[PDB]
Symmetry: D3
Subunit: 150 residues, 6 copies
Amino acid sequence: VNKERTFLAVKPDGVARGLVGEIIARYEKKGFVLVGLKQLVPTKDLAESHYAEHKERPFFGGLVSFITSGPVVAMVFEGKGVVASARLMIGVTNPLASAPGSIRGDFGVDVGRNIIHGSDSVESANREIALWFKPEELLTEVKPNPNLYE
Amino acid sequence: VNKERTFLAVKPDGVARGLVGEIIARYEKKGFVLVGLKQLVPTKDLAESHYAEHKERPFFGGLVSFITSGPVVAMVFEGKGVVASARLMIGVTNPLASAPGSIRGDFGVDVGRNIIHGSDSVESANREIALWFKPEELLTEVKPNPNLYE
Amino acid sequence: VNKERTFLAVKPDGVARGLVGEIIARYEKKGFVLVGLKQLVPTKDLAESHYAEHKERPFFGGLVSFITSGPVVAMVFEGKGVVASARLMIGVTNPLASAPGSIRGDFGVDVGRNIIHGSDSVESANREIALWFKPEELLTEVKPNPNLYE
Amino acid sequence: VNKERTFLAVKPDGVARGLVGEIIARYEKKGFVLVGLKQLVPTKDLAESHYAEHKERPFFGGLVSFITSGPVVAMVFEGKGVVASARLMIGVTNPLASAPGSIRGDFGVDVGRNIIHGSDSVESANREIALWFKPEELLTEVKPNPNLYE
Amino acid sequence: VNKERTFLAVKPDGVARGLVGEIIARYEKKGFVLVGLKQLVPTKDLAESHYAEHKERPFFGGLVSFITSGPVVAMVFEGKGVVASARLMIGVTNPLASAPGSIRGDFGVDVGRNIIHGSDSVESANREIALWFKPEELLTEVKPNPNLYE
Amino acid sequence: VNKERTFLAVKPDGVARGLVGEIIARYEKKGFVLVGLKQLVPTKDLAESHYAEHKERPFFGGLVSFITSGPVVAMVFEGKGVVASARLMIGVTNPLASAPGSIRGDFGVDVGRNIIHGSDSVESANREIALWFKPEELLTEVKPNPNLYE
Ligand SMILES: Cc1cn([C@H]2C[C@H](O)[C@@H](COP(=O)(O)OP(=O)(O)O)O2)c(=O)[nH]c1=O
Ligand SMILES: Cc1cn([C@H]2C[C@H](O)[C@@H](COP(=O)(O)OP(=O)(O)O)O2)c(=O)[nH]c1=O
Ligand SMILES: Cc1cn([C@H]2C[C@H](O)[C@@H](COP(=O)(O)OP(=O)(O)O)O2)c(=O)[nH]c1=O
Ligand SMILES: Cc1cn([C@H]2C[C@H](O)[C@@H](COP(=O)(O)OP(=O)(O)O)O2)c(=O)[nH]c1=O
Ligand SMILES: Cc1cn([C@H]2C[C@H](O)[C@@H](COP(=O)(O)OP(=O)(O)O)O2)c(=O)[nH]c1=O
Ligand SMILES: Cc1cn([C@H]2C[C@H](O)[C@@H](COP(=O)(O)OP(=O)(O)O)O2)c(=O)[nH]c1=O
Ligand SMILES: [Mg+2]
Ligand SMILES: [Mg+2]
Ligand SMILES: [Mg+2]
Ligand SMILES: [Mg+2]
Ligand SMILES: [Mg+2]
Ligand SMILES: [Mg+2]
């Protein structure tokens, strides 16, 4: 279905480096529709819930500390295969191993400062969207380009 | 002071044409700091208050109808001389008369579909910011590049 | 030989989305030489001949209907390994599976609206070129950059 | 009326420098619709007719010789105020005096190698269009973005 | 003459903000030829000689202190009217008053952090070039594009 | 360690095609720091030493002849995993096989005119850096963005 959604968040390093517009533009050019967007400074509670799956991993501490250190731009994009496509556009966890053309491939060098977060599955996307956005903050009627879909 | 702020809104035509990222990027590259950002579909009340100054002018009706027809991306940028600078970056009311390099100059052709709104003075910026944003939605501690300011 | 040629066509969705220049520019930057170029609205006969190989496949009907629905920009590029290189630059049949950096990877989401057509072999390139272009519409003496070839 | 048209031609220097796509893209982003497009090597007769107004001026000889020396990309764009707008996007006769953001301002240095030709009035546009294009080579039903026009 | 030269220097703020390539690219696209290029951290003696004309002005102290605080990328471009053209591409002393499309217009906000230095006349260009570059560091035989000059 | 360095050289074809800025910009956007930069025309001795490893290979003759035929822009970038990352950004030896998004993938077609040279290992990087640069031409104290490294 062309109504799948994914959650993306430009982390504090991405915001501080002035890459918000660059990132949003890549997704708009692709044809995905922006259905939610806001800038906020995450609380420790939000950070810990969002990254809950990593609680027993060694990088969790710094991960949570870093995401709550400055503004984050949260967004929700809608479109066919958006979760997997958005990941391909981001690259892989390690920016140095991400291919030129992807976001981390073009702009990142350190795994701890990898610019953006993207849901890894439809299940985690649905969970993240509900965590960061209230229902009234999301567009209900989406209208993409019919030049995009058959 | 380097803490002046302006209100900018990518109108429905700008959002539908996929120019949100392009626009935000121009302001980030300039060095202005994003202190507020959200996507919403304006109510008639908000539209009428925002454009109140034009109530007796012939284009008011269509102006209000158009801005409430689809999503709008509202943002607040902070920096030295941001109100006047943001206007120069936008161009002038008529896109056809806007110079190549400005937003309306590069992307617009019709005055009724001129892509973006930018406050025209510090007084109207302060008024617009309070109309569209709640205080908690705005960053209090701004941190630009010291490579930007002396 | 540096005189191999390929046939590329920006489909109606690509034309309507304003991607003609973006596409031509990628090929010019690569170093391929434009030897034929024209905009036309394909007739049913041209569409059916061009896509003949797909006549018994399920998508043929919509394929032919779509390509004849609006203007198409037809072009012929010349250069060493242009057929295979042009395909790599396009991506793969499914835009969602095309890598960031390729045309379909950066701009497409639906297989039925995948923006551009590129010959898949030297044999099909030669056939397509003769179908879409008359001999007098093609440059005979090509002059690329000697900074491009040894 | 939103159906005004202008004639633009990327001269041989523009074609040789690989600026065709860059130029077309600027006009597509602006919102003008491509209604005619073809690459051809101008004959002396076409060159002399096109530039007839300059026959008694000192640069006419070289002008005609240069335009017939290599391929030219001819195009017709349609939109509100396209003739005057297309000129503003081109810059002025002298590239060195053209403002950054315009085509000649960004890419040219010599008046004799100023990249592109654009009609200077609706009257000359109508004359040039008829000289370079046959009626069947021009789109009859144009369909721009309603996000562009009110 | 097409052999005029100008001296340009990307200041420490421009270098720290990662704008070296962006700046060089604008001049290459214009058609000017790079005849000298090097990165160095200016000594106080070089800074004071370069900016000698401003010794009695209030901003001289900070100017000299800032230019010696980090790396600077020095370059010499050659071409017809390069001194005046390079200035137009830079903008004006105050970045906020510089037009969108120019370097300071697109990237700067503070006069003390205005990114780049460009000679203001042929006389000062010749003086600056001799101050920053040794003769053997400059190309003697320049070869631009004949697609650039008549 | 975040202080690894690699040697990159924009070859004469890259310089002549006006791709110096484009190339430097890709590395600056990635987050690598420029620690050395200069334009020079390589002597036969430098060319032969640099490419010594290829002395018994068939392409050595033309390789050495070509690199000494015009200006070359030599640079040294510093950052975590810069040697391997810089190679990924360049593409592979054959430009036609290089992926869209990489330098050779986007701009090259012939192996003999493949635009840029990048060290293939830390050992060869250290050797090349010492061959092309004198110690005083290299920054000793590097200062990247802490938004880049954890
Ligand atoms: C796996 C891993 C992740 N992290 C941090 C940065 C990753 O964005 C974040 C989440 O891990 P992960 O979900 O693997 O990455 P992605 O961001 O691509 O979904 O955890 C590290 O710092 N080091 C590591 O080795
Ligand atoms: C003056 C004018 C404005 N309008 C609409 C589009 C303008 O964005 C909007 C507000 O007018 P104005 O404040 O003049 O323009 P700007 O948007 O540059 O601040 O009113 C018209 O449709 N026609 C006109 O003649
Ligand atoms: C294979 C396939 C193709 N098509 C359409 C879109 C493809 O451009 C067109 C031709 O098929 P194909 O030659 O496989 O693709 P390409 O365009 O990459 O050469 O047919 C579909 O709609 N669905 C499909 O599953
Ligand atoms: C006026 C002028 C024009 N020309 C050439 C280049 C111009 O493109 C061409 C046509 O002149 P003109 O119509 O003035 O310029 P434009 O191209 O902007 O319409 O004549 C010169 O070579 N030198 C000159 O002084
Ligand atoms: C005139 C002026 C210059 N300066 C600094 C920044 C300018 O780059 C530098 C040189 O002055 P100037 O030569 O006027 O500017 P430009 O850099 O455009 O040649 O002096 C100030 O800080 N404040 C001022 O009011
Ligand atoms: C291997 C190879 C290299 N060369 C030339 C161009 C290569 O840049 C240069 C060095 O070879 P190599 O080190 O393989 O390539 P790279 O430049 O990617 O490090 O030798 C050829 O001309 N033909 C070939 O088959
Ligand atoms: Mg994950
Ligand atoms: Mg106003
Ligand atoms: Mg096929
Ligand atoms: Mg004229
Ligand atoms: Mg000065
Ligand atoms: Mg090698």
